[PDB]
Design a protein around this ligand. Sequence first.
Ligand SMILES: CCCC[P+](CCCC)(CCCC)CCCC
Lengths: 160, 160
Amino acid sequence: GEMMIIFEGDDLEALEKALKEMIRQARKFAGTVEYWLSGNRLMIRITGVPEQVRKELAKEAERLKAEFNIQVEYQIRGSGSGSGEMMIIFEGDDLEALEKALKEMIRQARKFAGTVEYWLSGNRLMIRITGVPEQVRKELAKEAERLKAEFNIQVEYQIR
Amino acid sequence: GEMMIIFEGDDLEALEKALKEMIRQARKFAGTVEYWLSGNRLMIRITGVPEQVRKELAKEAERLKAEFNIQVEYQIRGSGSGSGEMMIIFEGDDLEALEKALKEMIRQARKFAGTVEYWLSGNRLMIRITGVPEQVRKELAKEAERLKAEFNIQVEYQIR
Ligand SMILES: CCCC[P+](CCCC)(CCCC)CCCC
């Protein structure tokens, strides 16, 4: 089970103060965190947490709300069984080769009933593939290595 | 001048079709693009474009709206003079060292009146610094190298 939390406030010092406390509590309960600050909005994505601590982390969210005077919202995903996550990175000085490799890597993951999230910035293209089991994450890694030699691009992948 | 465009639709094939056309037109007018697809929302960030083509790119957005039956919104930033962009990447197997380096890199950029955007995922920490001139982007690169040796982390930075 995972948990998505959003913090909003005009005081950056207050947001980051709340960030420090929230991620500590989540890690205190053996949870892997991921965060992203953009403007006055702070996203905190916590994974590997069951119903027990998700009740506590939510209570911590309400507590930091009143403490630092900021807005807070969250969503909870409990049911299963699954799945998994995968982050692939493409790099190269040829934009056409990257986007062409992107189209193929997308086709593969979506053929195997997986949801993809990609981001192109400069010469780097990052792909997040969620909703896939270990049986699939090994196959996509092979296809990622095929694209590596085919379009001569730098490729890195990490599984969690 | 830059331009922010958002596409929304339940048909992924329609979004990506519109994506291909929009980024071609932007690159056709010597514009550097950046895109991010998440769920049914597609962000397209175009930079290095004046009022002339921003009128055309907007018209292209309205055209793809009716063509693929999708939602479209955009924002335009024209005034100046400036500024610049900077992407710093921290990597390491120690989370405490990364976040401690993050706090310092944040302090430096915000002392020099710069806005920061950071994202922590796994062992990688990426920092986008906007609203800074060449005089500042050289100073932050030096401080990034200081943090590199201090916290023994892998550091990469790119200027645009
Ligand atoms: C959930 C974290 C989302 C942030 P980004 C992660 C992309 C993964 C494919 C996408 C936003 C780009 C404008 C990268 C943030 C900047 C460092």
